[PDB]
Amino acid sequence: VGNSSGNWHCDSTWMGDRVITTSTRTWALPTYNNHLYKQISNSTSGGSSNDNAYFGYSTPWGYFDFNRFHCHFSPRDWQRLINNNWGFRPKRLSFKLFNIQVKEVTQNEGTKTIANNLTSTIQVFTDSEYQLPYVLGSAHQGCLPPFPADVFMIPQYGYLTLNNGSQAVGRSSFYCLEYFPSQMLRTGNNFQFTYTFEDVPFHSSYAHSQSLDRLMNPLIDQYLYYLSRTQTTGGTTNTQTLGFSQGGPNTMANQAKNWLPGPCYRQQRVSKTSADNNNSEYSWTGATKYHLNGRDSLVNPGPAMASHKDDEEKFFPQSGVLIFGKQGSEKTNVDIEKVMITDEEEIRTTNPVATEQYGSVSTNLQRGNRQAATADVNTQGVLPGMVWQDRDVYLQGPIWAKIPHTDGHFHPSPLMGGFGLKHPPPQILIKNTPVPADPPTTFNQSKLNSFITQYSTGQVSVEIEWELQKENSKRWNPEIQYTSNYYKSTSVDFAVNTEGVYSEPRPIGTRYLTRNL
Amino acid sequence: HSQSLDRLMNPLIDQYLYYLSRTQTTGGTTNTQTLGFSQGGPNTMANQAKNWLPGPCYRQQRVSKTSADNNNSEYSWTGATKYHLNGRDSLVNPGPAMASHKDDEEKFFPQSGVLIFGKQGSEKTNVDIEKVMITDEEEIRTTNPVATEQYGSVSTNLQRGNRQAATADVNTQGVLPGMVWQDRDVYLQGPIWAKIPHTDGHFHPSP
Amino acid sequence: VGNSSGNWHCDSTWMGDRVITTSTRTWALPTYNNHLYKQISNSTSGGSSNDNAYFGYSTPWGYFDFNRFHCHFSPRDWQRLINNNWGFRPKRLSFKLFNIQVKEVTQNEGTKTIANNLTSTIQVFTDSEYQLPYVLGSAHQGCLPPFPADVFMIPQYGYLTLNNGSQAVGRSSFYCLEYFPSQMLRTGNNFQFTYTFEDVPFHSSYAHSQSLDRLMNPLIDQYLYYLSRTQTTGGTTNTQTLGFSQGGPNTMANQAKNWLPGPCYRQQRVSKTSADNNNSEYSWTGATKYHLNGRDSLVNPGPAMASHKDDEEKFFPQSGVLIFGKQGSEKTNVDIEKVMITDEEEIRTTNPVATEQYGSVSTNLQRGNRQAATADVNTQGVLPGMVWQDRDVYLQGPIWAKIPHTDGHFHPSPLMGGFGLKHPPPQILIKNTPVPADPPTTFNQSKLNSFITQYSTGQVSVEIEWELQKENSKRWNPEIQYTSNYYKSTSVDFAVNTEGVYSEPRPIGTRYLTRNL
Numbered sequence A, C: 001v002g003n004s005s006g007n008w009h010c011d012s013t014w015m016g017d018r019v020i021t022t023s024t025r026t027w028a029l030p031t032y033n034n035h036l037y038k039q040i041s042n043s044t045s046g047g048s049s050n051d052n053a054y055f056g057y058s059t060p061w062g063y064f065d066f067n068r069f070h071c072h073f074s075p076r077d078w079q080r081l082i083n084n085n086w087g088f089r090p091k092r093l094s095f096k097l098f099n100i101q102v103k104e105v106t107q108n109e110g111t112k113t114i115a116n117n118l119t120s121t122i123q124v125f126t127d128s129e130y131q132l133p134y135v136l137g138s139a140h141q142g143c144l145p146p147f148p149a150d151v152f153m154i155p156q157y158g159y160l161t162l163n164n165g166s167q168a169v170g171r172s173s174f175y176c177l178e179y180f181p182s183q184m185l186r187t188g189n190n191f192q193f194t195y196t197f198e199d200v201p202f203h204s205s206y207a208h209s210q211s212l213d214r215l216m217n218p219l220i221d222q223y224l225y226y227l228s229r230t231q232t233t234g235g236t237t238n239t240q241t242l243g244f245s246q247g248g249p250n251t252m253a254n255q256a257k258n259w260l261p262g263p264c265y266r267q268q269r270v271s272k273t274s275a276d277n278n279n280s281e282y283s284w285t286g287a288t289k290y291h292l293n294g295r296d297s298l299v300n301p302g303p304a305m306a307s308h309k310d311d312e313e314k315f316f317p318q319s320g321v322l323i324f325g326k327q328g329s330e331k332t333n334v335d336i337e338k339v340m341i342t343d344e345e346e347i348r349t350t351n352p353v354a355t356e357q358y359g360s361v362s363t364n365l366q367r368g369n370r371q372a373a374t375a376d377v378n379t380q381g382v383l384p385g386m387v388w389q390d391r392d393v394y395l396q397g398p399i400w401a402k403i404p405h406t407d408g409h410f411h412p413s414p415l416m417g418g419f420g421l422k423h424p425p426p427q428i429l430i431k432n433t434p435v436p437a438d439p440p441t442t443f444n445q446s447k448l449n450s451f452i453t454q455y456s457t458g459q460v461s462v463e464i465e466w467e468l469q470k471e472n473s474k475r476w477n478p479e480i481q482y483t484s485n486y487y488k489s490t491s492v493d494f495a496v497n498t499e500g501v502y503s504e505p506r507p508i509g510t511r512y513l514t515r516n517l
Numbered sequence B: 001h002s003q004s005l006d007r008l009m010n011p012l013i014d015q016y017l018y019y020l021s022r023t024q025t026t027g028g029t030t031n032t033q034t035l036g037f038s039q040g041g042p043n044t045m046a047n048q049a050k051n052w053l054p055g056p057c058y059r060q061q062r063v064s065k066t067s068a069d070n071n072n073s074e075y076s077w078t079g080a081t082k083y084h085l086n087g088r089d090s091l092v093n094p095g096p097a098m099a100s101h102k103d104d105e106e107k108f109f110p111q112s113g114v115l116i117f118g119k120q121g122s123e124k125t126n127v128d129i130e131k132v133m134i135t136d137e138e139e140i141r142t143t144n145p146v147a148t149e150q151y152g153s154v155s156t157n158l159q160r161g162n163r164q165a166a167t168a169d170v171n172t173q174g175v176l177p178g179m180v181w182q183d184r185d186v187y188l189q190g191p192i193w194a195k196i197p198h199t200d201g202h203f204h205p206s207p
């Protein structure tokens, strides 16, 4: 009461191989469902079939949504990191929330007054054992303000279990966090905790110099031969002969390679222009999707892929990449004018193009009587001899994810890009102390529903330590860097419009530094 | 498991991420080629964004426990799921890495997908379903798809303003990063452990 | 004020042979009778005769009602305990109440406002010497919320003494707790105390494998004989002969046994269906009851008994077992549709059936001239050679009871099932500090009646340590366990309906593990 909790510590630092940063901001915490649980299943769906089936509840508590970058780093520093280091990973993390302030609110005749009620308190905790359904990683909105000065509110919390559409199987668990320890905290009382990561391969934040098809010297040839002559073009009697050749400095396509492009999944090629697209609603039909327990659904935000080939800016995977609406986007049918679609013209070195075919294989077995068939191959699996690179980062997006604690997993690198962990940073959940309004003078068997509408605020602290690998390359020529366009514009990039409301001009990736393959 | 791949995300919220929910413009009879987009609708959670993916799969032949539900042809060795090796073509089970069936499909089960255990007192051949104890896999319908079921659907070529947008079906599949599953169960009325082939190339040598 | 009192500690743990659990919840404390005592006798009865006579008072104070299980344990854990251990008992207990908040309330023109009055305080204590009428054990309602998230109010307190109906004997004591020490506690000031149990036989939480009648081997016989031939069926002259036999593997009923079924009391057999019951109001008349000082009354919730015999689901003792209305039950005449009657088809091994006769004995003395009489025996007493098992637990019910400090007691095992103690955990009583409203400017001889309507809240902590005995049996076959039905239902069991209000689908017992008799 007569003392503050903690100063405002929010900056960045570059000690070299490490880079510590934190973000101090403020929030607000409103009551929910009037401190009451709920059962939210497809009974509240109103339309969908065994496709959008969901069976869960709504806890009166709330959680934190800071799993992004543009909310942890500033624009410039991001630039700083990107244009300088090849790879990075998170090392340490901390959390502090303090300077809490509870304010009850009376509503006498539409004339409401907001007073302060320090007598109240709050309860919050962390799920270390990961017994609660990990929610983040789903990249729900309502993240920490990608901006510092602006404050926000913490989103309520709700989860889902196994369900048979409008109903649920017995194997549908049920949870209630109020069955856990919670740092009961009153105003004046601060709160902090500590977390640490584990080893994870640094997100390869770099672009390659060569390609799989072109990693071999040109001046030489391959002492190895190949079938370059099925028939004999010795006239009109092109019989069945067997001519062979070697690594032609010109026939480098027919040459010999030792590696192979990563796995793939065929997507539907759409375009940024309108007239280039057919005239049929295939958004949910001609789309690439999978099937699960009848509950058929999309197979993205992604796959492990690259958007398109050279000079195909117009076309992009239908559901292959990410989509980020500029500041001020509604919930539906907004136009391309608002969003910032993610171009993947960067991985066209290792990963194929989803909108594109993948390969072509033998259909049966050619012979002197029956013709030689050549089948096409759009979809594929993985095999030894395949190498690729997962999705990029896009600070205007997720930062890390949650690995499903199961037995069978493979290269658990996220499909929304980022980092995966078998033991990820916990989930932070909070609620306002249930202040029972005026109780009946005489006894009653039932429970209390009456309360006092109240909420609180405070400062969110998060120290994220970081690891990095800087470019040590001898690339003689000036590689490419990322920089705000050096010309004169009306509203500076990442600047605050004359109304304080600022946005991001464009999305940003990492694969910039030309790292030799 | 308590949840599913498709439903591991909160419902109360949405995804600040958008997706292609409007190929054409239902603005009348002139449904041109437009580009409407949406976000993680608490209702459109199917079209929502997910980060993981169902384990690998292999299409099986869906049979049934009842008789009249099965066609009338001997496909036990023909319409069956099998592989090929040095001409020595053979079945591809007792199994694959899979789940038997979807919800309320007790009647149907993979033809050769799961295990079969005859109750005490079973001869060597043609015994009936009355004796054996077929293994129901209505448990992994959370991570692993259904062998008797299709797996996915992918783009066939490349739609365009003149040529229609094709959508090919995908029964068989391979593995990729972003896939997670769970091998077969135990069944104490069955094997306890196995033997890994001492070779060089092996992967998730789970039996 | 500038500090909270104690975190929210409420979970379960299984260290093995012990299991500690606690429940953190919140409550509310309203004033009562305006801080005034009362004399409640059959003067406020309005109807009843020397049958429902009561002479007591109403203290302005309140007490705690947490003597149940479903309010101390969660559903799953209960399952955990039951399906795993044969027997258990309580070992240690603690209590903490804090984060108090007093809120006065003004009422200006129907326009009331609830402010905070930290200046106030509260007074609460514990009765160790057991000088106050033990109230719990009577299983009054208003228990701790069998649920965690929901908060409640503490029930007022009132007791009763010896009375002659509408009046009371001089031997009718009088009590006033305000004549005891009370931890005067102001907000910000926490409160805690400590308690420990004493030795008590673990509630035999198990079902038997055999029966009294069938605990003997079948392959053999008994070298002992018995009277199996009164007359001689040697024709039409069935004289008086004396044939004898031994333990026939078929005549095992006539065989020899060494033990005997526990005591009994005849109940009225009713049924769950309607047409099976006669058409007469015997609810209070044809009922099993006792007599005391003219004050005739029922003889239950129970006796020491088993509900019914095999396949008699329809019939159950009229007043023999317990009754628990599902969530949302009024006070009277509700139907069977709401309650959850307790089936006792479990003790049909040791304890007879109350609705059933008990035995049959000789009436006089048969002889060659006078016929042999055989009287029936419905009611019984106890004798050496009798063994039984008291009532079950039913977590949707009481947890322990209070033994009457007297001289003559026997197998003080509760009739409402549970545990009995000669020195049970104390009773917790609280009240709000009497805040005398505006006193007259000039003097007055009389006392002050004017006050300020106010109340408070806080968190109830209760650490209950537990002892257990796990199944070590070599029962080759899979014994039976308790589990939620593995099918698909609309509303999951013990789940929160889509309105937060959750209930219990069915009652639960312990005698599950097949323990060899």
Ligand SMILES: O=S(=O)(O)OC[C@H]1O[C@@](COS(=O)(=O)O)(O[C@H]2O[C@H](COS(=O)(=O)O)[C@@H](OS(=O)(=O)O)[C@H](OS(=O)(=O)O)[C@H]2OS(=O)(=O)O)[C@@H](OS(=O)(=O)O)[C@@H]1OS(=O)(=O)O
Residues within 6 Å of the ligand: A364, A365, A367, A370
């Ligand atoms: O054994 S394989 O089926 O894999 O094929 C190699 C040999 O099979 C043939 C003929 O079959 S045989 O009975 O095994 O000797 O298969 C090819 O032709 C058969 C029928 O043809 S034939 O005219 O009698 O020779 C067709 O089918 S089937 O045998 O699988 O039922 C196949 O063709 S088709 O595309 O359906 O028209 C074809 O085999 S396959 O489908 O490609 O596997 C002979 O094939 S051949 O080389 O094309 O002539 C092979 O034997 S051969 O006599 O040495 O040619």
Ligand SMILES: O=S(=O)(O)OC[C@H]1O[C@@](COS(=O)(=O)O)(O[C@H]2O[C@H](COS(=O)(=O)O)[C@@H](OS(=O)(=O)O)[C@H](OS(=O)(=O)O)[C@H]2OS(=O)(=O)O)[C@@H](OS(=O)(=O)O)[C@@H]1OS(=O)(=O)O
Residues within 6 Å of the ligand: B157, B158, B160, B163
């Ligand atoms: O290069 S691709 O084959 O991958 O396709 C894109 C462009 O190829 C076309 C035409 O070919 S071109 O000679 O490369 O310019 O392919 C599409 O049409 C060709 C023949 O068509 S056309 O009427 O002359 O335009 C067909 O085959 S082939 O070129 O592969 O031999 C294909 O269609 S079909 O399904 O067999 O009928 C079709 O290509 S594909 O099979 O889908 O790959 C043009 O295609 S188009 O966009 O559909 O018109 C593309 O060039 S374009 O002139 O810009 O359209």
Ligand SMILES: O=S(=O)(O)OC[C@H]1O[C@@](COS(=O)(=O)O)(O[C@H]2O[C@H](COS(=O)(=O)O)[C@@H](OS(=O)(=O)O)[C@H](OS(=O)(=O)O)[C@H]2OS(=O)(=O)O)[C@@H](OS(=O)(=O)O)[C@@H]1OS(=O)(=O)O
Residues within 6 Å of the ligand: C364, C365, C367, C370
């Ligand atoms: O001593 S007992 O009463 O316990 O019984 C055994 C002997 O008593 C009798 C006769 O009584 S005596 O005066 O003690 O000798 O009792 C039985 O008969 C008497 C009267 O009967 S009798 O015809 O004169 O023999 C009845 O009553 S009473 O004596 O108790 O007043 C009893 O019967 S009844 O059910 O009321 O009809 C009956 O005795 S009891 O009630 O069963 O106890 C003789 O009884 S007998 O064996 O049935 O004949 C016994 O003496 S005996 O002469 O050896 O038979």
Ligand SMILES: [Mg+2]
Residues within 6 Å of the ligand: none
């Ligand atoms: Mg063939």
Ligand SMILES: [Mg+2]
Residues within 6 Å of the ligand: none
């Ligand atoms: Mg083609």
Ligand SMILES: [Mg+2]
Residues within 6 Å of the ligand: none
């Ligand atoms: Mg007599």
